[PDB]
Symmetry: D3
Subunit: 145 residues, 6 copies
């Protein structure tokens, strides 16, 4: 497990862009991670997306996954960042199904695929109550701000 | 059972002070309600309470409870307009364990009575079924603007 | 007198949860404190409490008193804080009238007793010397 | 006296740019107003001006003054939902910084209007000491 | 040639999630649009992404493009989308980021119409700063109504 | 040229009051400076100034000019960064606005050293959009310790 403070030792992200509230399982060997992001109406983006109809942005669901991928990529090499960041460089298959709503517990999954040099590929899935909500193959480049 | 949109039809509260994200059960016959508030680090009060140690203000837990009760009240009398149940007191209130980002604050409100338009509710808040806060909420019907 | 920066040396709270704008009197022999919070429509919480009807949340009034209480606690023992007085409970908490934009929320906190790490304060809040809220605040002095 | 709800009926400004918390006196006879803005540490502009040193931006003191003038203007012509656009000032001066916990007193005295160009004599004070003073010039629009 | 007010007539997005500041060219016969988003340090997301190292989130560039696409949509089918109607971002194949967008940059947004089988629309979008390629992707929206 | 980080080494201003997004020209010999501030609808003040009619507060334009002047002041005397010094805005003359700045505009900031009497500086300042005048004033500062 990992609470918000540990999470913040791995991600430089801060308000209003830290989209991982907890990491429930770190399958150290399976090279995969399970974490969630509580979706609440008391978040800053809801008012603008959209007035009268709150729907968590999809791009934000993407960002949530990449952030989880990042944590994983670090724990795998049993290290503690320095600044060091898994820069979101691209993505292939990227899809959404049902929309995420206030009150939902966005579940995040990321599985290690490859890594050619500095590039990393992850297979990420976001789900609400087991029902799939998003899926994409995230691509990151280990960089240093 | 009601989502954020239904919730906002009974509570006049708005961002950044709407602290009930969903109502799982509204037993109008038993005159009680069960709902919750998702605690996320991505909320505006965390940066200030406290930097480097996110802890949901207890006063917000009270606020979340009073809002839970409020929904029940409005429902009990089909009260829509906007006026609310003005939080006027509590004889006893206690906190146990702090609430943290990631928690799902479970809210319980049970209608007790109403004399002179003064409502008393019996509320409890819990996380992972462990008790977090309990208190007797006193609200008094009033029109916003009075 | 204590300006906002001295207050921030004692209270770890920050925007948008620092609810004491100035400490005006500190009576240590009598174990009481007088401070205040300025209410302004230019505060983040007003847009949501409530649209077209700005009223300072009662819970925030409580928060302001608990915060003033803590300053008093540290002051009573010459402490120069990572200690925090956690709000662990309250007895007979009551609100008389609502606090509105333009008001100067006066905060009074008086030491009642202490049993180890559990402190009890007698608190009141007033606008133009009129009662607005009162309660017995219970705090637990703990490491943040 | 005018509370915040009435003020919001004469000014189109809304959070985070409504800088008049209360109108204590509105002298329609003398064509002048007396209002104030409560300065609290819980305002959005303090974190950025400045970290460790909270000082109300002089420009917001100017804006607060212009806004008090605007309430006078609208009262005078009984204007409901236009705007009193800030077009200038000739001599503007700041004497001391305004800090958290200060009650920013705002004074506006109507001077004249010609071709829809309004001119007001403004002053701001804290604990009755002078903080700012300037001649605000506005022009109706929208 | 649309300003911010006209834009808010087509997109239901509002603060802090409206990322199209101006439409410089709307070529309907060419089924393509050109708009931009002024990037300023004075925006809510920079403090969190990242402290002392401001970099516009890539995901927000994707969002900016999906918004420009939506504006092109409505204009194409000559409608006045005054009814919460929206182009719900459903997916995207091949998405790339070629360099960080920083404050002061003027995010140039380009969206080219492609297909439209049933209610699912497809757009070929590119983002550039100082004419240099920044991002590129294939946005797939699914017209629905909130 | 100066990017946002360099700018933040000279100016202590932070969100939401940093109004210089980039410095394009620093002419020491001529004692002038050219910088700009990107105006985006995605900024905290627009919602309040005004709802449905976004206009950049003229006073913020003043602030933006004073901030650019400060940078000029330091560069002129080769003053190394974070000095803990602030060019405190203490007064002005001939302040005039000729037209509103709107979302999408790139506010151009010009500041020209006029004279210095010990700690009191005077600058000749102008702001423009698309090279057309928007604001002008003589900015008087007092170099003091933050």
């Amino acid at each position: 497990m990992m609470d918000i403070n540990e999470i913040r030792e791995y991600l430089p992200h801060r308000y209003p862009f830290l989209l991982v509230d907890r990491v429930v399982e770190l399958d150290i060997e399976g090279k995969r991670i399970r974490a969630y992001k509580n979706v609440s109406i008391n978040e800053p983006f809801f008012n603008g997306h959209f007035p009268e109809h709150p729907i968590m942005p999809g791009v934000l669901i993407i960002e949530a996954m990449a952030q989880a991928a990042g944590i994983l990529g670090f724990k795998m090499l049993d290290v503690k960042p320095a600044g060091t960041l898994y820069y979101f460089v691209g993505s292939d298959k990227l899809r959404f199904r049902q929309p995420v709503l206030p009150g939902d517990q966005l579940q995040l999954h990321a599985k290690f695929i490859s890594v050619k040099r500095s590039i990393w590929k992850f297979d990420c899935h976001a789900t609400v109550d087991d029902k799939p909500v998003c899926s994409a193959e995230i691509i990151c480049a280990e960089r240093k701000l």
